[PDB]
PDB file of C-alpha atoms in Angstrom:
ATOM      1  CA  UNK A   1      56.225 117.465  66.536  1.00 44.22           C
ATOM      2  CA  UNK A   2      55.065 120.525  68.612  1.00 45.05           C
ATOM      3  CA  UNK A   3      54.797 118.618  71.634  1.00 44.93           C
ATOM      4  CA  UNK A   4      58.174 116.873  71.015  1.00 47.31           C
ATOM      5  CA  UNK A   5      59.617 120.216  70.470  1.00 45.87           C
ATOM      6  CA  UNK A   6      58.209 121.948  73.574  1.00 45.28           C
ATOM      7  CA  UNK A   7      59.607 119.086  75.896  1.00 43.58           C
ATOM      8  CA  UNK A   8      62.871 118.862  74.076  1.00 42.25           C
ATOM      9  CA  UNK A   9      64.776 121.532  75.913  1.00 41.95           C
ATOM     10  CA  UNK A  10      64.352 119.898  79.457  1.00 41.63           C
ATOM     11  CA  UNK A  11      64.699 116.446  78.217  1.00 42.46           C
ATOM     12  CA  UNK A  12      68.247 117.104  76.728  1.00 41.58           C
ATOM     13  CA  UNK A  13      69.289 119.165  79.690  1.00 43.57           C
ATOM     14  CA  UNK A  14      68.197 115.976  82.014  1.00 49.72           C
ATOM     15  CA  UNK A  15      70.046 113.665  79.752  1.00 49.63           C
ATOM     16  CA  UNK A  16      73.062 115.853  79.941  1.00 49.72           C
ATOM     17  CA  UNK A  17      72.886 115.771  83.612  1.00 49.76           C
ATOM     18  CA  UNK A  18      72.821 112.019  83.741  1.00 49.30           C
ATOM     19  CA  UNK A  19      75.850 112.008  81.583  1.00 52.61           C
ATOM     20  CA  UNK A  20      77.817 114.655  83.610  1.00 52.99           C
ATOM     21  CA  UNK A  21      76.818 112.736  86.776  1.00 49.32           C
ATOM     22  CA  UNK A  22      78.210 109.384  85.227  1.00 47.64           C
ATOM     23  CA  UNK A  23      81.284 111.411  84.430  1.00 47.98           C
ATOM     24  CA  UNK A  24      81.550 112.860  88.079  1.00 47.63           C
ATOM     25  CA  UNK A  25      80.995 109.218  89.422  1.00 47.28           C
ATOM     26  CA  UNK A  26      83.886 108.079  87.254  1.00 47.83           C
ATOM     27  CA  UNK A  27      86.079 110.677  88.645  1.00 47.48           C
ATOM     28  CA  UNK A  28      84.985 109.773  92.228  1.00 49.18           C
ATOM     29  CA  UNK A  29      85.686 106.110  91.454  1.00 45.15           C
ATOM     30  CA  UNK A  30      89.292 106.902  90.117  1.00 46.66           C
ATOM     31  CA  UNK A  31      90.038 109.222  93.014  1.00 49.07           C
ATOM     32  CA  UNK A  32      92.788 106.958  94.458  1.00 50.58           C
ATOM     33  CA  UNK A  33      94.185 105.705  90.899  1.00 48.62           C
ATOM     34  CA  UNK A  34      97.817 107.120  90.264  1.00 47.39           C
ATOM     35  CA  UNK A  35      98.092 109.181  87.088  1.00 44.67           C
ATOM     36  CA  UNK A  36      94.382 110.011  86.543  1.00 43.88           C
ATOM     37  CA  UNK A  37      93.370 113.572  85.464  1.00 42.72           C
ATOM     38  CA  UNK A  38      89.893 114.456  86.431  1.00 44.60           C
ATOM     39  CA  UNK A  39      87.444 114.987  83.606  1.00 43.78           C
ATOM     40  CA  UNK A  40      84.508 117.287  83.232  1.00 45.39           C
ATOM     41  CA  UNK A  41      82.237 118.972  80.869  1.00 47.41           C
ATOM     42  CA  UNK A  42      81.075 122.398  80.255  1.00 46.17           C
ATOM     43  CA  UNK A  43      77.333 122.012  80.623  1.00 42.46           C
ATOM     44  CA  UNK A  44      76.180 125.006  78.936  1.00 41.39           C
ATOM     45  CA  UNK A  45      78.033 124.954  75.801  1.00 42.59           C
ATOM     46  CA  UNK A  46      77.308 121.154  75.421  1.00 41.35           C
ATOM     47  CA  UNK A  47      73.813 121.608  75.927  1.00 44.65           C
ATOM     48  CA  UNK A  48      73.342 124.259  73.394  1.00 42.10           C
ATOM     49  CA  UNK A  49      75.538 122.160  71.033  1.00 47.57           C
ATOM     50  CA  UNK A  50      73.250 119.044  71.377  1.00 45.55           C
ATOM     51  CA  UNK A  51      70.262 121.661  71.199  1.00 46.75           C
ATOM     52  CA  UNK A  52      71.379 122.750  67.634  1.00 46.30           C
ATOM     53  CA  UNK A  53      72.769 119.536  66.343  1.00 43.58           C
ATOM     54  CA  UNK A  54      71.038 116.339  67.526  1.00 42.94           C
ATOM     55  CA  UNK A  55      72.876 113.697  69.970  1.00 44.48           C
ATOM     56  CA  UNK A  56      75.580 111.614  68.566  1.00 41.52           C
ATOM     57  CA  UNK A  57      78.071 108.864  69.639  1.00 42.19           C
ATOM     58  CA  UNK A  58      81.509 108.257  68.924  1.00 43.65           C
ATOM     59  CA  UNK A  59      80.729 104.361  68.090  1.00 43.66           C
ATOM     60  CA  UNK A  60      77.876 102.022  69.087  1.00 40.47           C
ATOM     61  CA  UNK A  61      81.960 100.321  72.901  1.00 40.71           C
ATOM     62  CA  UNK A  62      80.014 103.389  72.814  1.00 41.49           C
ATOM     63  CA  UNK A  63      80.100 106.865  74.445  1.00 39.77           C
ATOM     64  CA  UNK A  64      78.498 110.251  73.735  1.00 38.96           C
ATOM     65  CA  UNK A  65      79.888 113.118  71.614  1.00 37.16           C
ATOM     66  CA  UNK A  66      80.751 115.343  74.489  1.00 34.33           C
ATOM     67  CA  UNK A  67      84.029 117.003  74.882  1.00 31.71           C
ATOM     68  CA  UNK A  68      85.744 115.443  78.113  1.00 32.75           C
ATOM     69  CA  UNK A  69      87.786 118.701  79.314  1.00 32.49           C
ATOM     70  CA  UNK A  70      90.583 118.439  82.088  1.00 29.78           C
ATOM     71  CA  UNK A  71      89.847 119.881  85.302  1.00 28.11           C
ATOM     72  CA  UNK A  72      92.508 122.399  86.667  1.00 27.30           C
ATOM     73  CA  UNK A  73      94.263 120.894  89.786  1.00 28.32           C
ATOM     74  CA  UNK A  74      94.442 122.526  92.741  1.00 27.99           C
ATOM     75  CA  UNK A  75      97.391 121.330  94.597  1.00 31.77           C
ATOM     76  CA  UNK A  76     100.041 118.784  93.368  1.00 28.47           C
ATOM     77  CA  UNK A  77     100.327 115.219  94.229  1.00 27.82           C
ATOM     78  CA  UNK A  78     103.030 112.823  93.842  1.00 29.24           C
ATOM     79  CA  UNK A  79     101.109 110.007  92.361  1.00 28.87           C
ATOM     80  CA  UNK A  80      99.729 112.259  89.767  1.00 26.84           C
ATOM     81  CA  UNK A  81      96.087 112.667  89.595  1.00 27.26           C
ATOM     82  CA  UNK A  82      94.013 115.797  89.836  1.00 29.59           C
ATOM     83  CA  UNK A  83      90.870 114.595  91.513  1.00 25.43           C
ATOM     84  CA  UNK A  84      90.439 116.812  94.454  1.00 26.56           C
ATOM     85  CA  UNK A  85      87.786 115.218  96.604  1.00 24.58           C
ATOM     86  CA  UNK A  86      85.904 118.501  97.790  1.00 26.31           C
ATOM     87  CA  UNK A  87      85.557 119.479  94.169  1.00 29.32           C
ATOM     88  CA  UNK A  88      84.286 116.380  93.375  1.00 32.07           C
ATOM     89  CA  UNK A  89      81.692 115.953  96.254  1.00 32.06           C
ATOM     90  CA  UNK A  90      80.338 119.592  95.501  1.00 29.35           C
ATOM     91  CA  UNK A  91      79.960 119.082  91.835  1.00 29.50           C
ATOM     92  CA  UNK A  92      78.304 115.763  92.497  1.00 25.24           C
ATOM     93  CA  UNK A  93      75.784 117.342  94.976  1.00 24.75           C
ATOM     94  CA  UNK A  94      75.123 120.326  92.691  1.00 25.71           C
ATOM     95  CA  UNK A  95      74.587 118.034  89.828  1.00 28.07           C
ATOM     96  CA  UNK A  96      72.173 115.928  91.751  1.00 26.47           C
ATOM     97  CA  UNK A  97      69.998 118.793  92.878  1.00 28.49           C
ATOM     98  CA  UNK A  98      69.972 120.131  89.161  1.00 25.13           C
ATOM     99  CA  UNK A  99      69.000 116.618  87.990  1.00 26.98           C
ATOM    100  CA  UNK A 100      66.028 116.759  90.452  1.00 22.79           C
ATOM    101  CA  UNK A 101      65.230 120.326  89.384  1.00 18.43           C
ATOM    102  CA  UNK A 102      65.081 118.877  85.777  1.00 18.78           C
ATOM    103  CA  UNK A 103      62.893 115.960  86.780  1.00 16.46           C
ATOM    104  CA  UNK A 104      60.545 118.367  88.737  1.00 13.67           C
ATOM    105  CA  UNK A 105      60.124 120.745  85.810  1.00 11.62           C
ATOM    106  CA  UNK A 106      59.530 118.078  83.269  1.00 10.15           C
ATOM    107  CA  UNK A 107      56.869 116.303  85.660  1.00 11.29           C
ATOM    108  CA  UNK A 108      55.286 119.697  86.161  1.00  9.78           C
ATOM    109  CA  UNK A 109      55.103 120.311  82.315  1.00  8.59           C
ATOM    110  CA  UNK A 110      53.730 116.714  81.537  1.00  6.97           C
ATOM    111  CA  UNK A 111      51.108 117.157  84.273  1.00  5.03           C
ATOM    112  CA  UNK A 112      50.295 120.611  83.165  1.00  5.68           C
ATOM    113  CA  UNK A 113      49.432 119.061  79.857  1.00  5.90           C
ATOM    114  CA  UNK A 114      47.554 115.895  81.349  1.00  3.25           C
ATOM    115  CA  UNK A 115      45.268 118.712  82.899  1.00  3.97           C
ATOM    116  CA  UNK A 116      44.340 120.142  79.688  1.00  3.37           C
ATOM    117  CA  UNK A 117      43.597 116.845  77.900  1.00  5.68           C
ATOM    118  CA  UNK A 118      41.820 115.118  80.859  1.00  6.67           C
ATOM    119  CA  UNK A 119      38.082 115.489  80.516  1.00  5.40           C
TER     120      UNK A 119
ATOM    121  CA  UNK B   1     102.458 124.371  95.477  1.00  4.64           C
ATOM    122  CA  UNK B   2     101.641 123.409  98.924  1.00  2.00           C
ATOM    123  CA  UNK B   3     102.626 119.654  99.289  1.00  2.00           C
ATOM    124  CA  UNK B   4     106.201 118.832 100.263  1.00  2.00           C
ATOM    125  CA  UNK B   5     107.366 115.370 101.512  1.00  2.00           C
ATOM    126  CA  UNK B   6     110.144 114.143 103.784  1.00  2.00           C
ATOM    127  CA  UNK B   7     112.948 111.694 102.847  1.00  2.00           C
ATOM    128  CA  UNK B   8     115.227 110.360 105.218  1.00  2.00           C
ATOM    129  CA  UNK B   9     118.897 110.262 104.216  1.00  2.00           C
ATOM    130  CA  UNK B  10     122.416 109.064 105.573  1.00  2.00           C
ATOM    131  CA  UNK B  11     125.000 111.618 104.264  1.00  2.00           C
ATOM    132  CA  UNK B  12     128.214 109.786 104.713  1.00  2.00           C
ATOM    133  CA  UNK B  13     129.534 109.075 108.169  1.00  2.00           C
ATOM    134  CA  UNK B  14     131.203 110.528 111.121  1.00  2.00           C
ATOM    135  CA  UNK B  15     135.027 110.725 110.911  1.00  2.00           C
ATOM    136  CA  UNK B  16     135.669 112.233 114.647  1.00  2.00           C
ATOM    137  CA  UNK B  17     138.288 109.840 116.250  1.00  2.00           C
ATOM    138  CA  UNK B  18     136.871 108.009 119.375  1.00  2.00           C
ATOM    139  CA  UNK B  19     138.978 107.324 122.663  1.00  2.00           C
ATOM    140  CA  UNK B  20     141.959 105.043 122.693  1.00  2.00           C
ATOM    141  CA  UNK B  21     142.052 101.997 125.146  1.00  2.00           C
ATOM    142  CA  UNK B  22     145.733 101.541 125.889  1.00  2.00           C
ATOM    143  CA  UNK B  23     146.053  97.649 125.775  1.00  2.00           C
ATOM    144  CA  UNK B  24     149.654  96.024 126.507  1.00  2.00           C
ATOM    145  CA  UNK B  25     149.759  94.464 123.183  1.00  2.00           C
ATOM    146  CA  UNK B  26     152.105  95.035 120.133  1.00  2.00           C
ATOM    147  CA  UNK B  27     149.680  94.351 117.170  1.00  2.00           C
ATOM    148  CA  UNK B  28     146.670  96.800 118.444  1.00  2.00           C
ATOM    149  CA  UNK B  29     147.363 100.031 116.666  1.00  2.00           C
ATOM    150  CA  UNK B  30     145.753 103.364 116.169  1.00  2.00           C
ATOM    151  CA  UNK B  31     145.868 105.645 113.178  1.00  2.00           C
ATOM    152  CA  UNK B  32     146.164 109.398 113.049  1.00  2.00           C
ATOM    153  CA  UNK B  33     143.160 111.528 112.822  1.00  2.00           C
ATOM    154  CA  UNK B  34     141.792 111.392 109.242  1.00  2.00           C
ATOM    155  CA  UNK B  35     143.924 108.418 108.519  1.00  2.00           C
ATOM    156  CA  UNK B  36     143.174 104.768 107.359  1.00  2.00           C
ATOM    157  CA  UNK B  37     144.674 101.494 107.309  1.00  2.00           C
ATOM    158  CA  UNK B  38     144.131  99.562 104.013  1.00  2.00           C
ATOM    159  CA  UNK B  39     142.793  95.729 103.770  1.00  2.00           C
ATOM    160  CA  UNK B  40     142.129  93.752 100.857  1.00  2.00           C
ATOM    161  CA  UNK B  41     138.228  93.679 100.701  1.00  2.00           C
ATOM    162  CA  UNK B  42     135.992  90.668 100.685  1.00  2.00           C
ATOM    163  CA  UNK B  43     135.368  90.865  96.800  1.00  2.00           C
ATOM    164  CA  UNK B  44     138.998  91.107  95.947  1.00  2.00           C
ATOM    165  CA  UNK B  45     139.138  94.653  96.116  1.00  2.00           C
ATOM    166  CA  UNK B  46     140.428  97.506  98.302  1.00  2.00           C
ATOM    167  CA  UNK B  47     138.973  98.886 101.421  1.00  2.00           C
ATOM    168  CA  UNK B  48     139.850 101.230 104.310  1.00  2.00           C
ATOM    169  CA  UNK B  49     139.184 100.940 108.089  1.00  2.00           C
ATOM    170  CA  UNK B  50     140.012 102.414 111.427  1.00  2.00           C
TER     171      UNK B  50
END
């Protein structure tokens, strides 16, 4: 209980990082599909929401209970998709580094605990 | 709004008359400027020509 609660914030943040990267990869895959609005999630609000109330799924075809918001387009396009590649690749790299940061923090905490237990 | 595309178009045709070749034949005729001869078109309809 105590150990589960202490490691729950970073674990949930890392899971939300994984889901956000899945969404960003879906946006990158559909970058040339005509009529596809780019989707993204508000990381902080959804993280607090998952924090207060546990993770839930729409079904389980299954998907998370996250709110898929639409990204504001930069410039218009005749085909009708709002996937701007610069934004997609910047968010992809930023999410990548933040996921690596979450892995580093969680691994440091778990070693910081094995150090105590080991004897 | 930054992206504006190009579309080719053909807005009608040019009605400036050309140069008349004088041929000593009674059946070759030339109309006045902005005048048209009438023929029965291919599909039983009416068409105009120079």
